[PDB]
Amino acid sequence: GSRKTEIIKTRLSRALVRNRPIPVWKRRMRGNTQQYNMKRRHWRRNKLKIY
Amino acid sequence: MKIRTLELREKSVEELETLAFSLKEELLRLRQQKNTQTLKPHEIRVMRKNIARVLTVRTEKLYAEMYEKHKNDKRMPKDLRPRLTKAKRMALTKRQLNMSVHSVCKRRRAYPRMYFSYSE
Amino acid sequence: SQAKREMIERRRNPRDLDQKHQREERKALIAERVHLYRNALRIPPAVYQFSTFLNQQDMDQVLSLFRNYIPETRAEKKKRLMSENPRAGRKPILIKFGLKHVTDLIERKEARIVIIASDVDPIEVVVFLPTLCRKMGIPYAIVNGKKELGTLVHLKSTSCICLCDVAPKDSVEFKNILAKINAIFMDNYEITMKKWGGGALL
RNA sequence: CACCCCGGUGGGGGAUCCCUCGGCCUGCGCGCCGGGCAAGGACGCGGACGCACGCGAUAGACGGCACGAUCCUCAGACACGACUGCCGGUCUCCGACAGCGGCGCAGCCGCAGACAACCCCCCGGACUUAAGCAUAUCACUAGGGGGCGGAGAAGAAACCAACAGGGAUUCCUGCAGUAGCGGCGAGCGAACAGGGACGAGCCCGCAUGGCAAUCGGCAUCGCCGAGUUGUGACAGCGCACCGCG
RNA sequence: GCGCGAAGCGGUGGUGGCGCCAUCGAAGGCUAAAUACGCCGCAGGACCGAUAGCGCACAAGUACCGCGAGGGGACGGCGACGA
RNA sequence: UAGCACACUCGGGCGCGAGCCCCGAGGGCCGGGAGACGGGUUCUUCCGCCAGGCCGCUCCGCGGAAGGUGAGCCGGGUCCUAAGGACGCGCUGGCCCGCAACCGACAGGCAAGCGGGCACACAUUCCCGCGCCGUGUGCCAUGCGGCAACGCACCGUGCGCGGCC
RNA sequence: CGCCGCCAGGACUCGCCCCCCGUGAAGCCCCGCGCACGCACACACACGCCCGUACCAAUCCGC
RNA sequence: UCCCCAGCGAACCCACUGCCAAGGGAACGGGCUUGGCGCAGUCAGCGGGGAAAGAAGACCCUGUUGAGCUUGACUCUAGUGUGGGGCCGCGGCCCCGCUU
Ligand SMILES: [Mg+2]
Ligand SMILES: [Mg+2]
Ligand SMILES: [Mg+2]
Ligand SMILES: [Mg+2]
Ligand SMILES: [Mg+2]
Ligand SMILES: [Mg+2]
Ligand SMILES: [Mg+2]
Ligand SMILES: [Mg+2]
Ligand SMILES: [Mg+2]
Ligand SMILES: [Mg+2]
Ligand SMILES: [Mg+2]
Ligand SMILES: [Mg+2]
Ligand SMILES: [Mg+2]
Ligand SMILES: [Mg+2]
Ligand SMILES: [Mg+2]
Ligand SMILES: [Mg+2]
Ligand SMILES: [Mg+2]
Ligand SMILES: [Mg+2]
Ligand SMILES: [Mg+2]
Ligand SMILES: [Mg+2]
Ligand SMILES: [Mg+2]
Ligand SMILES: [Mg+2]
Ligand SMILES: [Mg+2]
Ligand SMILES: [Mg+2]
Ligand SMILES: [Mg+2]
Ligand SMILES: [Mg+2]
Ligand SMILES: [Mg+2]
Ligand SMILES: [Mg+2]
Ligand SMILES: [Mg+2]
Ligand SMILES: [Mg+2]
Ligand SMILES: [Mg+2]
Ligand SMILES: [Mg+2]
Ligand SMILES: [Mg+2]
Ligand SMILES: [Mg+2]
Ligand SMILES: [Mg+2]
Ligand SMILES: [Mg+2]
Ligand SMILES: [Mg+2]
Ligand SMILES: [Mg+2]
Ligand SMILES: [Mg+2]
């Protein structure tokens, strides 16, 4: 909330860079059974537990 | 494998220290070209790996050099002792386990092991 | 509280010095509180007989006899054994030392003179040594210093000292020193074995 | 016309059957953590990389050895060794200190933390059974605390016996659901044998006195230290271990 | 645990006392093997065959929930991978 | 079926598509703008949508691709203590307890930054102007005025006594 | 005031006064004096660490 | 608001259900018996009935099922208090000094 410790922001950045779709070149790989990232996180539905 | 290990064995340890610094510089110039322009996909890969290759040969030469420095030392450095296990490093030696008192020595000496065969 | 910090200063109680850095301060305080309690109790004759030790002039006369029979050092022994005859000469006369050895020579009645240290703690290591030396008739003396007895035999300290025979060049010195210490220790046994010290003295 | 029933086709849903790189069970093997920084965590690391998995600033194969031609989504890499395998390096940071302890000790070390199936020590229930219930039972269990090891613990009789005597411990069989304990209620409950597996025995202390003969440390054959309040003893290990069928 | 507190002879004898006779030597120490056992590795099996079998054959202790201690799923299948 | 927007209206625009998106006009209504905790990229730009939004959407806190958070002066730490905690040691069979290093405040105590520009958004942080604070190095003087209230020599360190609600 | 006037309201604030069987922090920094020490403010030069920093009257918590 | 519409779009509940009268029946039937009727199965109202739905009756009883609580219940128990012993000191007459 605009004031955070160093640990809170690093955990918040790690949650942010994680939250992205599957790169589209991975859909052409053989044995890629994943179509969308099921671990996508939306900020309003899913909460992070970064206190 | 752009820098081969065959050439790195000829260099000395401080000569490999300067090479890893020079190769780290070229990796920074490669990471510049990756951000600004295109690159062949494994150029950063290759330069990262031959930094590791120079540093490994540096470590392998340094383990060999430091071993012959402290070979006949009372206490060798902990790097150069074999890392068995904390329990196995603290084990008694086989000489120490075979240590017995004087009565057990005299008895085994005066009554040694006999080699015999029985038949009825 | 400031009154309590003054309270634990007025009493000198070693159990108040409970921290780690106060450890050397504490055991100095224990040593003096023991010493005041040790001498305020009625010391029995078995312990208090070691308070009567030998005079400084008499101690120097006693040990000057013993210095003729000082055992060899380890450096002297080492070159003695590499010599051509290590057992050359007659059997030497040495100070016999150590509690196991000395009480064996006392019970076998072959010690001529026994020196017992005075400062030995636990004192029960040597409390039998006067009364055993009387039951064998061996003349004994109590000398202050386990440390001074240790230097005669090249140790830091040793509790009891004896020698089993005297050279003929020291025989009349030996009978003068036996008569000097028997008037103190051996002949005053039945007086010293009733004498209570400490708080009984007051 | 709606409604209902039967059939056909189409839906709907995922039963059935077939499959199975998964589980479960049993046996065997292994039984190897940690200041040389463990377990666990945090954060980072792929050219395009989210997750998973791998890894640690040497960060998505670094070295040696073996292998020998592919890896692949793109781009590319590749006999100056692809893809692999085995082993070794590197191995961030948090997480084991108000630390504690040993040794004369220029200093060198150890303990802590993990593991919780097995084993050892301490602490220790209640539901339950008694057709209630309080002793009893559950149970000297569960659980908690502490501590090891590859096993542990036990162990060479202050034993069993009553014979014509056996002979460490542990385990099996067996004594035996017995003797016995028990509101003699519910219930609980061993031991010696006999048979067997396996087998193994030893030691400190009161060691010389014509000399501690013993040990620790070192910058080492000499010091310093321990020690007479008493130190003192060597029989077991190791290597090798295929490539075709 | 506490009180008392030994001995040169002592302990014990299914366990009241005492006596006999018999049998051992406590209050110091070590000791393989046979014995027990999870993870893991290996091999098996009259086991189960995707609501079964482990909670998980799948990006499973994951997603997700709980302040917290903790709780905890669901989801397998084209073909000659040549079209 | 229950239920779900029912103070808006008119014209225009982009667009396959418009009651709701944009623009203009008219008519109304009420908060809006800054911090904390909490959220964590929702911010902003570009592109999208036949999915989500209690209708629709060309819109969006949605989907995709990007961009963005710059400090001696703001806040915290490198400072201080409060109530209080305390992993060490004593006391223990274990606690309690005693001493207590250390810790404990993003609203306490508490050095010093404002005006403006720029900008898609962000800046008291960048830029411009004018300041200020602290630290570290160098380079030393050895005092005076006023009856008095006091005025001044832009000087330091230690101790003691005091100094805030 | 010197290098737009007049009137009113106002957060806040000094001191009086009132209130209390309530009396309204601590410590560091700092300052002052006292007593000692020995010297560096100005000036000039140099320098200034880590973390946070977007946004949130539909962005929070009540699924 | 309802009502009607575009779009969106649930839940409760559900053995099966044409409606009455009397009778019989577990003694108050939607179904049985004997009679009386109604049936295009639609819209909106409505609260008579379905002994309407909620919820393994909270009342009452039973249980050798509890818990909260009380005390002159039973058996115990922390706490308080008491006696004796252990807690190694000197002196003097249980008493008095003393300190270590
Ligand atoms: Mg926050
Ligand atoms: Mg929310
Ligand atoms: Mg049909
Ligand atoms: Mg299924
Ligand atoms: Mg198994
Ligand atoms: Mg590590
Ligand atoms: Mg490699
Ligand atoms: Mg441990
Ligand atoms: Mg049960
Ligand atoms: Mg019962
Ligand atoms: Mg029952
Ligand atoms: Mg009952
Ligand atoms: Mg182990
Ligand atoms: Mg053992
Ligand atoms: Mg039992
Ligand atoms: Mg010995
Ligand atoms: Mg073949
Ligand atoms: Mg006997
Ligand atoms: Mg009998
Ligand atoms: Mg024994
Ligand atoms: Mg199936
Ligand atoms: Mg399953
Ligand atoms: Mg809740
Ligand atoms: Mg409707
Ligand atoms: Mg409205
Ligand atoms: Mg705001
Ligand atoms: Mg926006
Ligand atoms: Mg749409
Ligand atoms: Mg710590
Ligand atoms: Mg503050
Ligand atoms: Mg500035
Ligand atoms: Mg803004
Ligand atoms: Mg409608
Ligand atoms: Mg009727
Ligand atoms: Mg009818
Ligand atoms: Mg109707
Ligand atoms: Mg009704
Ligand atoms: Mg009922
Ligand atoms: Mg009954």
mmCIF file of all heavy atoms in Angstrom, chain H residues 20-22 29, ligand 34:
data_model
loop_
_atom_site.group_PDB
_atom_site.id
_atom_site.type_symbol
_atom_site.label_atom_id
_atom_site.label_comp_id
_atom_site.label_asym_id
_atom_site.label_seq_id
_atom_site.Cartn_x
_atom_site.Cartn_y
_atom_site.Cartn_z
ATOM 1 P P C H 20 -60.901 -31.631 -2.983
ATOM 2 O OP1 C H 20 -60.226 -30.684 -2.084
ATOM 3 O OP2 C H 20 -60.605 -33.070 -2.902
ATOM 4 O "O5'" C H 20 -62.457 -31.431 -2.784
ATOM 5 C "C5'" C H 20 -63.175 -32.210 -1.853
ATOM 6 C "C4'" C H 20 -64.651 -32.136 -2.115
ATOM 7 O "O4'" C H 20 -64.929 -32.677 -3.427
ATOM 8 C "C3'" C H 20 -65.506 -32.961 -1.178
ATOM 9 O "O3'" C H 20 -65.806 -32.268 0.016
ATOM 10 C "C2'" C H 20 -66.732 -33.269 -2.018
ATOM 11 O "O2'" C H 20 -67.618 -32.168 -2.033
ATOM 12 C "C1'" C H 20 -66.130 -33.405 -3.409
ATOM 13 N N1 C H 20 -65.820 -34.800 -3.801
ATOM 14 C C2 C H 20 -66.778 -35.799 -3.978
ATOM 15 O O2 C H 20 -67.983 -35.608 -3.793
ATOM 16 N N3 C H 20 -66.372 -37.019 -4.366
ATOM 17 C C4 C H 20 -65.099 -37.279 -4.587
ATOM 18 N N4 C H 20 -64.770 -38.502 -4.966
ATOM 19 C C5 C H 20 -64.110 -36.301 -4.433
ATOM 20 C C6 C H 20 -64.521 -35.101 -4.060
ATOM 21 P P A H 21 -65.643 -32.985 1.432
ATOM 22 O OP1 A H 21 -65.526 -31.939 2.452
ATOM 23 O OP2 A H 21 -64.623 -34.044 1.351
ATOM 24 O "O5'" A H 21 -67.043 -33.682 1.651
ATOM 25 C "C5'" A H 21 -68.248 -32.978 1.424
ATOM 26 C "C4'" A H 21 -69.396 -33.937 1.361
ATOM 27 O "O4'" A H 21 -69.448 -34.548 0.050
ATOM 28 C "C3'" A H 21 -69.272 -35.116 2.290
ATOM 29 O "O3'" A H 21 -69.612 -34.812 3.623
ATOM 30 C "C2'" A H 21 -70.163 -36.141 1.625
ATOM 31 O "O2'" A H 21 -71.522 -35.814 1.827
ATOM 32 C "C1'" A H 21 -69.842 -35.895 0.167
ATOM 33 N N9 A H 21 -68.742 -36.743 -0.318
ATOM 34 C C8 A H 21 -67.463 -36.354 -0.552
ATOM 35 N N7 A H 21 -66.681 -37.282 -1.008
ATOM 36 C C5 A H 21 -67.509 -38.371 -1.083
ATOM 37 C C6 A H 21 -67.293 -39.684 -1.492
ATOM 38 N N6 A H 21 -66.130 -40.152 -1.920
ATOM 39 N N1 A H 21 -68.322 -40.538 -1.434
ATOM 40 C C2 A H 21 -69.499 -40.095 -1.008
ATOM 41 N N3 A H 21 -69.826 -38.883 -0.606
ATOM 42 C C4 A H 21 -68.777 -38.063 -0.658
ATOM 43 P P A H 22 -68.580 -35.165 4.788
ATOM 44 O OP1 A H 22 -68.824 -34.255 5.917
ATOM 45 O OP2 A H 22 -67.231 -35.286 4.217
ATOM 46 O "O5'" A H 22 -69.025 -36.611 5.241
ATOM 47 C "C5'" A H 22 -70.330 -36.822 5.740
ATOM 48 C "C4'" A H 22 -70.855 -38.164 5.333
ATOM 49 O "O4'" A H 22 -70.707 -38.332 3.905
ATOM 50 C "C3'" A H 22 -70.127 -39.354 5.899
ATOM 51 O "O3'" A H 22 -70.477 -39.638 7.233
ATOM 52 C "C2'" A H 22 -70.506 -40.438 4.917
ATOM 53 O "O2'" A H 22 -71.856 -40.813 5.112
ATOM 54 C "C1'" A H 22 -70.428 -39.676 3.610
ATOM 55 N N9 A H 22 -69.090 -39.755 3.007
ATOM 56 C C8 A H 22 -68.115 -38.812 3.022
ATOM 57 N N7 A H 22 -67.024 -39.160 2.405
ATOM 58 C C5 A H 22 -67.302 -40.427 1.956
ATOM 59 C C6 A H 22 -66.566 -41.358 1.231
ATOM 60 N N6 A H 22 -65.334 -41.128 0.811
ATOM 61 N N1 A H 22 -67.124 -42.535 0.931
ATOM 62 C C2 A H 22 -68.362 -42.767 1.356
ATOM 63 N N3 A H 22 -69.156 -41.968 2.047
ATOM 64 C C4 A H 22 -68.564 -40.805 2.316
ATOM 65 P P G H 29 -57.959 -38.983 7.517
ATOM 66 O OP1 G H 29 -58.873 -39.973 6.929
ATOM 67 O OP2 G H 29 -56.795 -39.439 8.303
ATOM 68 O "O5'" G H 29 -57.428 -38.055 6.357
ATOM 69 C "C5'" G H 29 -58.327 -37.450 5.448
ATOM 70 C "C4'" G H 29 -57.885 -37.701 4.041
ATOM 71 O "O4'" G H 29 -57.642 -39.123 3.879
ATOM 72 C "C3'" G H 29 -58.892 -37.322 2.965
ATOM 73 O "O3'" G H 29 -58.186 -36.971 1.782
ATOM 74 C "C2'" G H 29 -59.583 -38.645 2.707
ATOM 75 O "O2'" G H 29 -60.219 -38.731 1.456
ATOM 76 C "C1'" G H 29 -58.405 -39.594 2.799
ATOM 77 N N9 G H 29 -58.762 -40.994 2.996
ATOM 78 C C8 G H 29 -59.796 -41.489 3.725
ATOM 79 N N7 G H 29 -59.872 -42.780 3.673
ATOM 80 C C5 G H 29 -58.843 -43.150 2.843
ATOM 81 C C6 G H 29 -58.437 -44.422 2.415
ATOM 82 O O6 G H 29 -58.924 -45.514 2.690
ATOM 83 N N1 G H 29 -57.351 -44.351 1.576
ATOM 84 C C2 G H 29 -56.727 -43.206 1.198
ATOM 85 N N2 G H 29 -55.684 -43.364 0.384
ATOM 86 N N3 G H 29 -57.091 -42.010 1.592
ATOM 87 C C4 G H 29 -58.154 -42.062 2.405
HETATM 88 MG MG MG I 34 -64.051 -35.999 1.918
#
